[PDB]
Amino acid sequence: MSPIPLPVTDTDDAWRARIAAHRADKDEFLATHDQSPIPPADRGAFDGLRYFDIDASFRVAARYQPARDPEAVELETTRGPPAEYTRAAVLGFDLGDSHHTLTAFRVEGESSLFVPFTDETTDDGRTYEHGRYLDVDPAGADGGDEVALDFNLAYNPFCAYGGSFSCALPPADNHVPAAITAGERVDADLE
Template sequence: MKGFKYIIVVGVLLIVGYLVKDLFFNDESYNQAVLKFRESKDLTFRSVTRSPLPDSLRRAFNKLTYYAPTRDYEVSADFTPIESAEPVAIPMTTGTKEPYFVKGKASFDLDGQTHTLTLFQKAGSVSDTLFIPFTDQTNGFETYGGGRYLDAIPNGKTILLDFNKAYNPFCAYNPEFACPMPPAENRLKVKIPAGEQEFAKRD
């Protein structure tokens, strides 16, 4: 009987060990994938033909600055689709406006509060990827003051919001670009210390 109990205990410990190992390597694989994506983006920013940076900044560019990836800010949100008949006019940083369709709302819990973001699709686009311009309490301090963007694809009644992939608009690097400004309903009353930080013009 004692031997049987010993086998059960060892079996349970092995199962727990495998689960912990699996969790660790899943997180490690996720972090590595995020870092690879960031390295690829840095290469794009060094490119003569694809970089949003003006030549004076591109030549001195080293890399973008990010928060360390963490799955605490990979959030599964409830998705409520909306099929707007007419597009809304989103103000741009240049003072113009461009048409975007409202495609849904994403609601999620973070830091003990429930938050909601409106998701858009640019008029004329056929992509399943939805556009989320937002601000949070890091803007103007650790991140670009004009807000950041996030892209996500709905999966039925849920949508994965990975703030580790939050990125700056091109006008954060070059004011000649026209960038959509986050609407009032997408101004989050919480810090999101994930994704891209404010661009340092001198690396």
């Protein structure tokens, strides 16, 4: 907008606070709220969701380029009919062995961008193999600015909890040739 997006990680106090509050949200949402119920067997054994240590190394700075021509694309779902998401942005970053460019979609009413992507750890099945969601703050950025891709906040669809929801299966172009060990872990056993 006016300053180049960079304090998108606010301060590390408020970044850690973001993560703690966001996982506390993903902790209580399916346990207390009826909108996404965990199956009564697993919900009875509910102690709390997975928390990984705040990973600064998996928080990379990604060169923000908004979709100059934003359109509704069809992502496949395990739920049934495919889910249309509008192209909000594309983030150009480097990780592991390779530089990649990752597609950020718009969720209606949500200010945070939904990035469905895959990598070597999802291919390994010990993170959500059908795809990861990333909550990316645009901070009103434009072509040639940057935003923080904190992969530590690469989360899993609510299907992983034993529910039947819509997981936006991304194109193969959203696959990174790297293992992103920080996230919420999942298993082909569960999901």
